[PDB]
Amino acid sequence: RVTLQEAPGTVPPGRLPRHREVILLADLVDVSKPGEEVEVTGIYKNNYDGNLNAKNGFPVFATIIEANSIKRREGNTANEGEEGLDVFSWTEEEERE
Amino acid sequence: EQTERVFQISFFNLPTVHRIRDIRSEKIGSLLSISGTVTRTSEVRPELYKASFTCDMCRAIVDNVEQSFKYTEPTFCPNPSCENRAFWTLNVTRSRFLDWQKVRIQENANEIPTGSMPRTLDVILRGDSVERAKPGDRCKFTGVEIVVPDVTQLGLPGVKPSSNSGVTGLRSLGVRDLTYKISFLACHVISIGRDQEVFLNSLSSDEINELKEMVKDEHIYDKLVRSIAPAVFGHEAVKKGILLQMLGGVHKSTVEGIKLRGDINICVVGDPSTSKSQFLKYVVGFAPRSVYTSGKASSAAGLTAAVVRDEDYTIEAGALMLADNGICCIDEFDKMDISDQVAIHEAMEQQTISIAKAGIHATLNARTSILAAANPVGGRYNRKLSLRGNLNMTAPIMSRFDLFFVILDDCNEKIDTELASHIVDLHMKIEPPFSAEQLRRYIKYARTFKPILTKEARSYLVEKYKELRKDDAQGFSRSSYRITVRQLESMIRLSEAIARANCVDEITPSFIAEAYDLLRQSIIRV
Amino acid sequence: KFSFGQATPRTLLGIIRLSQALAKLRLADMVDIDDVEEALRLVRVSKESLYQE
Amino acid sequence: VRKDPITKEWTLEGGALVLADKGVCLIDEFDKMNDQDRTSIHEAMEQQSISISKAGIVTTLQARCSIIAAANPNGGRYNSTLPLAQNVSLTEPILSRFDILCVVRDLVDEEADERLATFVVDSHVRSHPENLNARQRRLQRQRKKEEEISPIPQELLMKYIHYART
Amino acid sequence: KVSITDQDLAKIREVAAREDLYSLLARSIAPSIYELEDVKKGILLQLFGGTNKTFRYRGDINILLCGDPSTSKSQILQYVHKITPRGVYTSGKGSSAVGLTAYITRDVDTKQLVLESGALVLSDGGVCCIDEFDKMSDSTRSVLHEVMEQQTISIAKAGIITTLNARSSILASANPIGSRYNPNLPVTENIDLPPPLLSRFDLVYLVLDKVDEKNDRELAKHLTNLYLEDKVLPVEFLTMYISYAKEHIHPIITEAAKTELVRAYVGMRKMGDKRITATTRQLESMIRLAEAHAKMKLKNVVELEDVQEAVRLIRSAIKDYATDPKTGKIDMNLVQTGKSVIQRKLQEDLSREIMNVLKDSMSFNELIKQINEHSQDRVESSDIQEALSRLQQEDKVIVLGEGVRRSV
């Protein structure tokens, strides 16, 4: 269960950053080191918890992202327009070239 | 795929506006217009609105179960063969959810009686009115005022009651008491404190006429220069520089990913009696997304950024960041120390602030144009020395400033007469050829232009840069000191800004000659 | 020589309160020349103590 | 090291030289960092391992970084008449780590100035935002612009470098 | 609570029609304090202030009370605080009662992010009487710069970004360094306050208690009157008369006043014109004192007489807080001309010295050896390295770290 936080680059200046918890299931664990910046594709589900309802006093639910893929964008923030989960991954034709 | 539409009636423009102090429990269930300064906003969580349960056996669907402050669920199954009094499985897909945000507003500063602490309130925002009240902004909420019970006492499937006058005796309560808390429920909130075609289509025809008169004008450039900061007498060169600053250049990005700066930085160095702070105040009060700050470093966060431990680390936004995509009017640029100047060397050229302090590491964005105002060393400007001598700034930071404007209060008996007549004249009442609201739309229209360099413009630009470097050559080894390739990029930026002033999409060699004059006048100061 | 002396309104208030205390020790309304002479002598001696040796 | 706010014990978290492990760490304005901050990369730049023994946490992290640092000579201008040690505030222990030390001089040559100005103006024209569907037409335009200056495409250069490294 | 009227309007007309209204108000400001005639006058004008012109123009009076430590520097502060409707007495050094600046606090109870306003804000229209202005921290000195310049306090902390309207009046009173104020030394060298902060005050009165038996006899007799006291003046009517004048009266400046003012400024400047006497900030402040004097007496028109009254006040203040050959730049800059000549001589002496030496280089100690010994008198050491900074900027000499230093 990795905890995404809004990137300081995309946070509006002077505002507090929002954050959502992200569940990494099998084969996705240990793929995002702490402090790195990543792009998470996944289902945006919500589950009911009594603690949140008690705290806020309204029938409010807690949301969470079940990650389906992760691409790290830390250290390649100028690499927009590229395709794939790994910009540096090469196909067989690329290796032949 | 029918999608039921839930409506939200919004009432606004109430005859009277209440306040946090004027809250009374006798107004519960009534429309108010509470106004206060927001200090904290929660996340946009989805709250259950119209639940739809499916019982665990016989799969019967209980639907449109209205929800109270609790997690109320149906008690009985419509099918007369299902045994279910506490067992259901909510259908999340079928249920209807609503955006829910809780803002923590407080009393306005001017409404707080002396000594008394401000009174706070918790205002619930639902639907489209979510995220419309940012912290710090004074908003004028309006909606029903309700009272929120303690749902812990009411009993919840996942928690237990936790330990001022609480009533009791309810069937669902038993022996525990119930306490109530007043909380506003806002239905409408307002704060009280781009291609060319896209911009044009968003402008009314009457404004389109005024803009058409400007763009077709012959002396539009000089009129704009004279219309910048009308309350300041003289200083046409500084007015022109400030005008070119707002237009800016083109923030180009090359194929290799390297970003080329498009913002123009000005430094108005002048004697202590001059009108530097007036220019800075006009710019901060006119240009959108602009801030005013001094070199005294008021806040703990510097001009750029800082990390503060929470009793984890978080980033405090500095002055150079709050003015992103705008103008950062820095005052007293000399007062801020040399150990502070090294922080903005990157923020003024690469336009990013890179922080790696402790567990936090980010490359923050500062796409700002700096309008500094530095007093010369020794208080009064000394014309016997070059601009380098009169300023404590070093070469790396002095080369990042596009324009240097030197303004002096020469002891002229006549000039003081016009100055005094002007200041006293203003305090008594300046006729600008373009009013502020009228000029703002012209600047917005001109910013949509992205001028390009013609073929002869490139040759003229290269020749002018060669002349600049030839005239700046110093030393036996011919080592340029004041003029680097940053000056060539500065000529390009000023040419683009000038072409935007004339609202022309092509850069002519006349514009490059004018930009060369603007740079030359800032370095021939000997 | 040391500037820690320039008699100040506060020295007058201290003199008045010292004289009041001295009379307060000796019956009532004893504040006369006899009391103020002792009070000023004490004040001057204390000032001279700062200039000892 | 930090005290974990939830479990309340000391835990170790990496910094720039760990987030850049088996990569590159870029230090702009090298000469302007504090000396007691600049000396902290002596071990990780030669031994390539960060040794931490604070708050009862005795461990040696691994940081196989490759520092690329941009400096600035004393006084803002590189004085060619003085040795290297007299132009920088850095000392021998940190100057010996750098395998290649490139000295950049900003001289005045009319031919060189002309060529550099021509290149810069051409690059500014090329990078202008106003310069068979949308996607592959845009890709074709990007390749057309790239082929002018870079003999090998950048999107292939990154993969080439990664393949050679790994 | 154990703790506006037509007749009130008649009383206002009665007091306003009095010829001696100005002196009467001056006396009523600080009845228990003797002398200090002009200080009470300036404080009275501060209570009214200039017209709040809109279209930003301050339209307010900022007064600093310097001089050697003065009990009145505090007594008259409490008096004016009691007199002014709004505002709050605050100590700059301590700031125990009020923090003097708006900062976010966690109120503990519910641990919420409550924003509490400082002393500056909440005193709009009122006078925020500062005390111990010299010993206040640098961080709050920057806040004072912002409030007197920008008129608003902007906060960006804990996700809250906002600007708070201050619109306050500053009446500070700072004790000097050392045992007592030294009249011979300039005000900057005695008060320990940055020149930009000192130049922001319209009227800065140097309240001194210099020794002389002639004045001391009368002062001590008046003091003994106070001792014997305890064992016409509108004492309280003025605290609402000021509000009535602030609301009902909106002074407007006329053309004769315009000509008189322009003339006054040009005259002040020419008094000395190489040096630089007055500045446009002082011109705008005079525009403020004349407006305040018209606001008082309930005439709502800035007639000619108020102009030279304010000019006299400004000229007396300048003659007080500036040196004997009144400069008007030492207050705006620690480096005075009689000081600036020292650096301009040292820089060239250093240039020529290093030149004749190469005829090569040395660290700081050797440079001191040939400067303070025989080149001139025993001058201060840091001035030499300060002029070395100007020489570095001119690129005449190069400093090789902590040690030697040569010329290119």
Ligand SMILES: Nc1ncnc2c1ncn2[C@@H]1O[C@H](COP(=O)(O)OP(=O)(O)OP(O)(O)=S)[C@@H](O)[C@H]1O
């Ligand atoms: N050309 C001018 N036109 C209008 N007002 C001027 C002009 N020159 C000076 N002033 C006035 O002079 C006063 C002081 O100018 P400022 O803009 O405050 O400069 P400054 O901030 O005082 O300079 P320093 O070095 O920070 S003290 C203001 O009231 C200005 O309106």
Ligand SMILES: [Mg+2]
């Ligand atoms: Mg200023």
Ligand SMILES: [Zn+2]
């Ligand atoms: Zn059922």
